[PDB]
Amino acid sequence: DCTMYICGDSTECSNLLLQYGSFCTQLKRALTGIAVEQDKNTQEVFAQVKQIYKTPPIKYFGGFNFSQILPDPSKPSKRSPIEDLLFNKVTLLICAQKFKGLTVLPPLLTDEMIAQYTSALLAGTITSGWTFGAGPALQIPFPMQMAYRFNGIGVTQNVLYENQKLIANQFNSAIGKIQDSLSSTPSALGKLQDVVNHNAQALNTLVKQLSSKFGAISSVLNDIFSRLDPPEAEVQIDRLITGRLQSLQTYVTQQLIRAAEIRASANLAATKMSECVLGQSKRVDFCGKGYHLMSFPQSAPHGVVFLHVTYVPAQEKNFTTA
Amino acid sequence: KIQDSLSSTPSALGKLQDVVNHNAQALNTLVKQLSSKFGAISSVLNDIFSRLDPPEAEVQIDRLITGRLQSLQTYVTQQLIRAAEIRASANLAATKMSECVLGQSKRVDFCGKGYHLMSFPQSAPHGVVFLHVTYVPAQEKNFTTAPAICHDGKAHFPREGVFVSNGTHWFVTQRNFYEPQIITTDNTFVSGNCD
Amino acid sequence: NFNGLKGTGVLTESNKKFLPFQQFGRDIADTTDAVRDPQTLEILDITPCSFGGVSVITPGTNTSNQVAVLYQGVNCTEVPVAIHADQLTPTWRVYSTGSNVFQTRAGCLIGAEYVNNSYECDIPIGAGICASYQTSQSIIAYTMSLGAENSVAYSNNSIAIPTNFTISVTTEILPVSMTKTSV
Ligand SMILES: *[C@@H]1O[C@H](CO)[C@@H](O[C@@H]2O[C@H](CO)[C@@H](O)[C@H](O)[C@H]2NC(C)=O)[C@H](O)[C@H]1NC(C)=O
Ligand SMILES: *[C@@H]1O[C@H](CO)[C@@H](O[C@@H]2O[C@H](CO)[C@@H](O)[C@H](O)[C@H]2NC(C)=O)[C@H](O)[C@H]1NC(C)=O
Ligand SMILES: *[C@@H]1O[C@H](CO)[C@@H](O[C@@H]2O[C@H](CO)[C@@H](O)[C@H](O)[C@H]2NC(C)=O)[C@H](O)[C@H]1NC(C)=O
Ligand SMILES: *[C@@H]1O[C@H](CO)[C@@H](O)[C@H](O)[C@H]1NC(C)=O
Ligand SMILES: *[C@@H]1O[C@H](CO)[C@@H](O)[C@H](O)[C@H]1NC(C)=O
Ligand SMILES: *[C@@H]1O[C@H](CO)[C@@H](O)[C@H](O)[C@H]1NC(C)=O
Ligand SMILES: *[C@@H]1O[C@H](CO)[C@@H](O)[C@H](O)[C@H]1NC(C)=O
Ligand SMILES: *[C@@H]1O[C@H](CO)[C@@H](O)[C@H](O)[C@H]1NC(C)=O
Ligand SMILES: *[C@@H]1O[C@H](CO)[C@@H](O)[C@H](O)[C@H]1NC(C)=O
């Protein structure tokens, strides 16, 4: 709220800001435009499908293990195990003392319905494959949605059926290793830790400038009206008014530039949850390094984490060709 | 039904409606801002040079010179950011019209929801409207499936298709349209043994 | 004004231990939050008062004239302190006391009644609530739904294959250029 940030509970300071005229309206109108768009950004990513597909009540998906990713009813917050860490490594007084004109509006989608959309994408990508993103969601096993995903590589289907269990064990060991690597690495959630840090840094610098002189004698508003006769006060509180208004324009202008790169990354995640997840992409080094197989979306606070699965050739030989 | 739908729902052309509404509002707010005071005497430049003594007047009109300069600086800065999100959509239209129109695209959910067939550009005021002709399956039927088949000790695999059955006969068909055929060597290639 | 400090707030107690010479109290954001009483030695506290804004939940003006209101970040057990109904009209005090009261993490809206049925969203509210105008002549605030449950029957030998198709035409709209200008 412009009025409360620039002037406190002062009645005569409200009329001085009114003399500037129509400056504060642009600030609120810009900030809503971001706040509406932030609730829009979640809908293009997690809400690619409308029918919330129920998770299968029976395990043993062909020979693989999806316990780490598929939600566990024994938990009191209905989330999955790998998602369980992701809510602890990322951190967020913290939100209570900022009430000096500013506020933190709650998101329209909470952490439960986001955890249900992710649990709906996961339950369709297992028993249906890519169909459920183009019409009625059909049904097909998972030891087959894998053999029709080696066919896009060019390695054909003889590699999966034959020698089936080792590929099951390689996938099982690979999903076991990803839990430990996220725990120890310092920057594992580096791209989301600094996002919540930058907003914390931006608000703290904005609120720390309320106690600055800006060329005046003091940063207090009501006391300097009584230590000084009326002409001087006007000839000094303009400095505090133009100091904080320029200090609030800098905060707003940074947010539009910052929101222009989250939207550049929401659209990169809206085109990654619709090509890697709902299909198989042939764009090189797009859906994971190497040849692509599938993906598994997972949620995170103010972000999203994709869990790619790739195919990388290994031991090689020498031959004579014609 | 396309002609009826755009002429019915009034939010058919909302996207482009906000484009001309934002620019109309931006210019209108800019014009009304020069009636402000900015802590000075009045928004009319003539009266300050009349009543105020000359050296003090120069002080009071410094508010109006930088007050309107801050109003143009704010207005220009918004257009600089707003032109960035249009060029992000102009490059998206130049990408769609060079792939969805002049070819058939395989990027899922890029040229229309479903499997893409064609496109048809149409000119709209300050924008473009596409007509993504797509493909959607309709009615599903249950079947019993097997991952392979072996005749004489050696497994067989589909050349391109899925093995299906309806209770007593096994058929190979395509993946997006039901059409059974008889299992011959043209559909099967051998690999390994069926143990 | 006690201990030489002018300001507004709520004087309550807390669990602190001041030093024998320390007098004031300040936080990270550099504001007063703990003032020791000169006459009596104990630990006090200062909390902010009221704040928040309002939102006029209205349907189309051709269909209704009565409106709801939303109080962001205000507990329903202490609204009339933050409403200050002594200075307000009884027309405005309808949204101060009454049967229709509701609490959520987004706020404490009033003038609308919660309904247990769930269907599609019309006007967003906050933290998973949507409001719509259903008749008669009242505004409801239901819980937003995400859709129906297909509940696909997964099996190890079940395949579904479509036998018919449909051809559809989807219209999408993009801006290409805004209006040129010069100054
Ligand atoms: C899938 O992986 C989970 C996670 O390791 C397995 O659960 C473990 O099961 C063993 C014995 O069954 C226990 O000793 C571990 O304590 C379990 N881990 C946890 C975290 O509880 C599960 O058995 C695996 N399932 C399949 C089918 O492979
Ligand atoms: C499964 O489909 C096949 C092919 O459509 C059916 O086989 C035909 O059945 C009709 C009527 O019984 C016979 O007149 C044909 O001679 C059969 N074709 C062959 C090649 O034998 C079969 O009946 C279907 N099974 C069920 C249970 O409906
Ligand atoms: C495939 O679906 C189309 C409609 O999507 C069917 O066309 C309809 O057929 C019935 C009877 O044959 C007619 O009464 C309708 O007027 C047709 N609709 C249209 C839009 O033409 C078609 O028959 C279906 N084909 C099969 C083999 O089931
Ligand atoms: C294949 O290339 C040459 C053969 O002349 C030799 O270095 C070796 O056999 C192979 N090199 C590898 C595997 O790097
Ligand atoms: C048949 O298909 C429908 C999908 O429309 C499914 O609900 C049902 O369980 C299937 N029945 C069998 C026996 O496969
Ligand atoms: C104005 O009234 C019409 C007539 O029913 C109806 O469209 C609606 O209530 C109002 N229009 C809009 C755009 O809200
Ligand atoms: C509002 O206050 C009541 C008790 O006065 C409390 O139970 C409830 O949790 C509060 N609402 C919040 C904190 O959102
Ligand atoms: C209607 O909603 C209220 C609010 O939670 C709840 O207490 C009540 O049990 C609901 N009624 C029914 C029949 O479920
Ligand atoms: C699961 O697959 C095995 C593989 O042969 C099969 O025997 C079993 O019947 C399947 N389960 C169900 C419920 O059909």
Coordinates of C-alpha atoms in Angstrom, one line a residue, chain B residues 12 15-16 75 79 86 89-90 96 126-128 130-139 141-145 164 173 177-178, chain C residues 150 153 155-183:
Chain B
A12 CA -12.7 -15.3 -28.0
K15 CA -5.8 -11.6 -25.6
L16 CA -5.5 -8.9 -28.3
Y75 CA 6.3 5.5 -19.2
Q79 CA 7.2 0.1 -22.9
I86 CA 5.7 -9.1 -27.2
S89 CA 5.5 -13.9 -28.4
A90 CA 6.4 -12.6 -31.9
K96 CA 4.7 -21.7 -34.9
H126 CA -2.2 -6.4 -33.8
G127 CA -1.8 -10.2 -33.7
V128 CA -2.4 -13.4 -35.5
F130 CA -4.2 -19.8 -36.0
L131 CA -6.6 -22.7 -36.7
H132 CA -4.8 -25.9 -35.5
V133 CA -6.5 -28.8 -37.2
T134 CA -5.8 -31.8 -34.9
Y135 CA -6.6 -35.5 -34.4
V136 CA -8.4 -37.1 -31.4
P137 CA -9.2 -40.8 -30.8
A138 CA -12.9 -41.5 -29.8
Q139 CA -14.0 -44.9 -28.6
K141 CA -12.2 -51.4 -26.5
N142 CA -10.6 -53.8 -24.1
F143 CA -8.3 -56.5 -25.3
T144 CA -5.9 -59.1 -23.9
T145 CA -2.2 -58.6 -24.8
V164 CA -3.9 -58.1 -29.2
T173 CA -2.7 -54.0 -35.4
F177 CA -6.7 -47.3 -35.0
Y178 CA -8.2 -50.7 -34.6
Chain C
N150 CA -11.0 -41.6 -14.0
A153 CA -7.8 -50.1 -14.1
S155 CA -3.4 -54.6 -15.4
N156 CA -0.5 -56.7 -16.7
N157 CA -2.4 -58.0 -19.8
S158 CA -5.0 -55.3 -20.5
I159 CA -4.7 -53.0 -23.6
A160 CA -7.2 -50.4 -24.8
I161 CA -7.1 -49.6 -28.5
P162 CA -9.3 -46.8 -30.1
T163 CA -11.6 -47.8 -33.0
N164 CA -12.8 -44.4 -34.2
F165 CA -11.4 -40.9 -34.4
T166 CA -12.5 -37.3 -34.5
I167 CA -11.0 -34.3 -36.3
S168 CA -11.2 -31.1 -34.3
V169 CA -10.3 -27.5 -35.0
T170 CA -8.6 -25.6 -32.1
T171 CA -8.2 -21.8 -32.3
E172 CA -5.2 -20.1 -30.5
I173 CA -4.4 -16.4 -30.6
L174 CA -1.1 -14.6 -30.3
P175 CA -0.1 -10.9 -30.3
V176 CA 2.6 -10.0 -32.8
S177 CA 3.1 -6.3 -32.4
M178 CA 1.9 -3.4 -30.3
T179 CA 1.1 0.2 -31.4
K180 CA 4.1 2.3 -32.5
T181 CA 4.5 5.7 -30.8
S182 CA 6.8 8.7 -30.6
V183 CA 7.2 11.6 -28.3

